[PDB]
Amino acid sequence: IAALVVDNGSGMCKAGFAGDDAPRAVFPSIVGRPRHQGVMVGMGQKDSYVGDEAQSKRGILTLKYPIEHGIVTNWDDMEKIWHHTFYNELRVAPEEHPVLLTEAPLNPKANREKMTQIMFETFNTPAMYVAIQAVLSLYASGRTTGIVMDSGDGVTHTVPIYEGYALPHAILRLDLAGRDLTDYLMKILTERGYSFTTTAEREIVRDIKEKLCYVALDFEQEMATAASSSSLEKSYELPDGQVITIGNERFRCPEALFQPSFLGMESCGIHETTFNSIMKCDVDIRKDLYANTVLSGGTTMYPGIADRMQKEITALAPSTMKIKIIAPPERKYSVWIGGSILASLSTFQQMWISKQEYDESGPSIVHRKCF
Amino acid sequence: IAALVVDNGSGMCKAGFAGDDAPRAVFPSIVGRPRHQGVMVGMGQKDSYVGDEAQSKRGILTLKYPIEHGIVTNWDDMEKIWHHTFYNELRVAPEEHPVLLTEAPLNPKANREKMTQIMFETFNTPAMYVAIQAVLSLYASGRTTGIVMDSGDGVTHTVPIYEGYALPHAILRLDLAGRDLTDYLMKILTERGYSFTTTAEREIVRDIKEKLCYVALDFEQEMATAASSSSLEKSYELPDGQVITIGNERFRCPEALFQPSFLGMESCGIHETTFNSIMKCDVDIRKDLYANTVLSGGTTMYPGIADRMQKEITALAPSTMKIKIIAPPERKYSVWIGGSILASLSTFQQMWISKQEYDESGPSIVHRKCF
């Protein structure tokens, strides 16, 4: 009856139960290992910390992200995150009831094979399934037709769906995402006079990114305003009590999504990426796809992103075109909400992959029964 | 006619005329003040000492470096060094010839602005240009492609070059350098039994480093050899006549460059920093960058640093790749030599910033007409 849904996005990892409208295991997917000897022997301490434990003590731990650009690199640290979230956070034995997994499109074929094998052997869950995070966004919004723009932390991907049967030839993948945005803002702040080199303070920069930065409609005009006025200037407090000010850098970083030439990337802007995906589609579907556009992911929380996105699309698209952006609240958990709705559906029970099928045909069946 | 060039930074400032084969004015950039009340009438020595004056009587003054980690921390004493260079040592008025200054990349904008303000108001230089210390090393070796590892006293940094077109996104700045390396020697020597706490003896340790320390080809194997033999031990004479013996520590201090975990700094090693610089670039240009590596700065003076860099990169880099370590003799003056060649170039005469340009658009002009 009950089913487990888990989002495997880089950074923030969410988990919960099927049918729920909000996940309860909301913890960062980081693994810390101390780089110092333990002189004090009052307690045995630990050589590994996952989730909220590492975030609080990030000053001594060496933060490592097991998932980079939606691609698993260190499987050993990935297991610790999975092991911790099943027992410590959710207090649920995985074997009792099935689990669900989410992943980005265009993932390496080796990534899917090892992810499924871990489920069957290490945790021995009865059944699981991997679905494209872009597809699940449509279920959360309620519509079954539109274009989904998942701009997450590690990977930004775009998938066009028209009453089902998503076009595989019109899918675009861009590596410029939240992880690179934070690193770029680390270099920009050096110009103002602040240094955030080490990985321990790579997290405060992200907190700054989620609190102060905002997207401006006109990138060029704001340069005159920012460089000739202190209104755009804002203050912020570090954990140690120092006071820093953000001037023109407040809107410089979030604009990089539209001009990736700032990071030296040959890829076009995200607005052009969405436009190119629609262009590859046939004319009979282009008019419909323009109306229903859904934005999903963490990097969509920037104020004014919806109005900014429609402006560039309107300029690119011809006249008399219905350029509409749908950005409802709680879209940060859009991937998780759709997974809960899909898992709770009685129709979805049939195309689960069982343990007997995996044993008979090996892990390669994940590319035949599952898409 | 000839334009003055100055590679002013932490450590020993160098100055000279354009077209010269070696900087004539070389002296430590140290400003000190007495810490005792004067007792001799007619002694007549001033309350401020700079350069070789402070070095000679360093047992009385409190040495304070005006430049730390590439960023000027105090402008009152910095102007003294600039004043002393042009008047007391060079004996040439700077108001008649152009001045070229150098600075490290990835530095606060306020550092450049205040530098330009002084050079146009206090000294009234007809024209100024500021160049990145990394790109000037290319003209020293007469090349166009190749990473440079400029290991200054305050800050080490690496900028990839490929027939011009400096990549701004692949520039990494690391705060580990010679100055912070010296502070490690004091803590290490305390284990042996010698105590150097105050800054008066800080110069003494620096003199020890440049005469005895060296880099081994294998730190682990060298540990066993030195721990069971007196061959590595070499004697040294202190200014007061005391003889101090240096044991296995002779190579441990230089090794901190490759293993910053010895110093507690989280960043990767020097070789890992160099390897990471190339990786961020496109594969099409990685082959040439591997065959052209230019060394620079004073801290790369340790014997055997050429072999160690080649060995470390070889393990990181794929096999059957030509890795050539270009470490020409007298590379300590490479940054200044490149500046002299650049000034004499006829094409560079159009890149100078005139006082009229500074007056028209304020000091902020240096961010537009200069790199």
Partner: peptide, 7 residues
């Protein structure tokens, strides 16, 4: 990854 990006 295995070529282009760091992964």
């Amino acid at each position: 990854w295995x070529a282009x990006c760091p992964a």
